[PDB]
């Protein structure tokens, strides 16, 4: 009798607003341009499924349309926050050794997880054997670099779709977004852009976690009296 | 249970159908969030192909009217001693300054490049700019 | 009256620079491994130039130098490849140290 009211006021309520956590104020088209989020790889490296998000090629250097990145990034930040508000397990993945330390720290700060190392076969599809039969897999995976060190898609992108886990990914002009649920077209190479993505996902997650403690405190306080 | 058919449909379609069939007793956590705020494109796997024959990519080059001016400035003079500062967003290079004057003089009514180009260099020399031609 | 993305791209220093071939830029050293000097110059990738022999001591993290860019991204397609092979760095020459 109390679970229905508890569920509706807490879980269903945020799903009724377009922007419950107000993540659109965390960034802007100019904040992305100053971080070189629009700079893509060269034309010869261009992937076919990334053409829709390419504004053009200036001197054989593809330019990512930041107007679409904002709309795509708004949906990823909203989806990321709603899963942290729902007490879901978020996992960060990136095989770029230059940013391995930065990402591992962010996950620790936001009380989340990270996997920046060599991805052993079966971490997801054969998890119960590696970890244990009562293990709980992630509810959301965030790819800061969808490619491995041989310029090919990360194996987790395919393994996540097998286990029905939604993925958020930063796809550059030489990546494959077909199996990525919420892709964000932007530069994934320069350090000035990676620090932004981490700063944005670290903030959206920290907000949702604190936003639920306020909603629960009110419900608990109101419930007693 | 579940369905590991990553190529068939998407995680939403594969999960929406199994829940409605009765296989999945409880819908996953992310499901209610995806149905409310879905992405622009359904994440369906599609195999990449090669273009053959006369097919080509719709991507176009990013050219401007002032690129003709820059090409000539760099040819006549070339990059000067001044080094670019790409960090500074509101940075103006010696060539860019030449374009602003060249365009401003175009508003006056001159319709030829040779005279208009020559007059632009003189204005900068009057302002103190150093313009060493390749010759 | 919010600025659009087409206006940012037109007036950006990189855009107006044009072909990077033989362009003088100013970089910043952010990582040093042995003699190798990893330099950022406001581009997508960095460039790795070797420590000069004449005066190496002055080249520490934060030092700002002068470069002559040759390419913004080293790419090439070889026999049998379906896409270009990129090295994930730029090609530049370390001229000296910037002094104001």
């Amino acid at each position: 009798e109390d679970s229905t009211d508890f569920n509706d006021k807490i879980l269903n309520e945020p799903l009724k607003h377009s922007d419950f956590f107000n993540v659109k104020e965390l960034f802007s088209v100019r904040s992305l341009f100053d971080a070189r989020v629009h700079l893509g790889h060269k034309a010869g490296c261009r992937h076919r499924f990334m053409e829709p998000y390419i504004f053009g090629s200036r001197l054989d250097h593809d330019i990512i349309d930041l107007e679409q990145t904002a709309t795509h990034l708004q949906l990823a930040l909203n989806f990321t926050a709603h899963m942290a508000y729902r007490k879901g397990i978020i996992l960060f993945i990136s095989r770029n050794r230059q940013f391995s330390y930065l990402i591992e720290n962010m996950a620790r700060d936001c009380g989340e997880y990270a996997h920046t190392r060599y991805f052993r076969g079966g971490m997801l599809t054969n998890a119960r054997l590696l970890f244990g039969p009562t293990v709980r897999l992630p509810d959301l995976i965030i790819f800061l670099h969808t490619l491995n060190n041989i310029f090919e898609p990360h194996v987790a992108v395919r393994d996540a779709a097998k286990m029905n886990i939604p993925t958020v990914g930063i796809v550059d002009t030489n990546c494959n977004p077909c199996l990525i649920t919420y892709p964000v077209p932007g530069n994934d190479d320069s350090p000035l852009a990676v620090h932004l993505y981490c700063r944005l996902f670290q903030t959206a997650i920290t907000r949702a976690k604190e936003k639920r403690q306020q909603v629960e405190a009110l419900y608990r306080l109101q419930g007693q009296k | 249970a579940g369905s590991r058919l990553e190529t068939v449909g998407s995680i939403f379609s594969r999960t929406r159908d199994l829940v409605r069939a009765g296989v999945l007793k409880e819908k996953p956590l992310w499901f209610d969030v995806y149905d409310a705020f879905p992405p622009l494109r359904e994440p369906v796997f599609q195999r990449p192909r090669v273009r053959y024959g006369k097919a080509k990519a719709p991507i176009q080059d990013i050219w401007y009217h002032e690129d003709r001016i820059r090409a000539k400035f760099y040819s006549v003079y070339g990059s000067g001693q001044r080094a670019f500062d790409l960090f500074n967003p509101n940075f103006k290079s010696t060539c860019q300054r030449f374009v602003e004057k060249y365009t401003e003089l175009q508003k006056l009514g001159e319709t030829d490049e040779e005279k208009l180009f020559v007059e632009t260099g003189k204005a900068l020399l009057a302002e103190g700019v150093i313009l060493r031609r390749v010759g | 009256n919010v600025e659009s993305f087409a206006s940012m791209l037109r007036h950006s220093p990189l855009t107006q620079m044009g072909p990077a071939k033989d362009k003088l830029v100013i970089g910043r050293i952010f990582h040093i491994v042995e003699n190798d000097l990893y330099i950022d110059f406001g581009g997508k990738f960095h460039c790795v130039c070797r420590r000069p022999e004449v005066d190496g001591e002055k080249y520490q993290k934060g030092t700002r130098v002068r470069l002559r860019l040759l390419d913004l991204e080293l790419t090439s397609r070889f026999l049998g490849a379906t896409t270009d092979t990129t090295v994930l760095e730029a090609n530049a020459v370390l001229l000296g140290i910037q002094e104001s």
């Binding site: - | 080059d61 050219w63 690129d67 003709r68 | -």
Partner: peptide, 26 residues
């Protein structure tokens, strides 16, 4: 509409084609 959009133009920075030492000679 907007005036900052790019235009359909040929490459201005394109360099002339190279020639052999004997180009134009008998």
């Amino acid at each position: 509409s907007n005036e900052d959009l790019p235009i359909s133009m040929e490459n201005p920075y394109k360099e002339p084609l190279k020639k052999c030492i004997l180009c134009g000679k008998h």
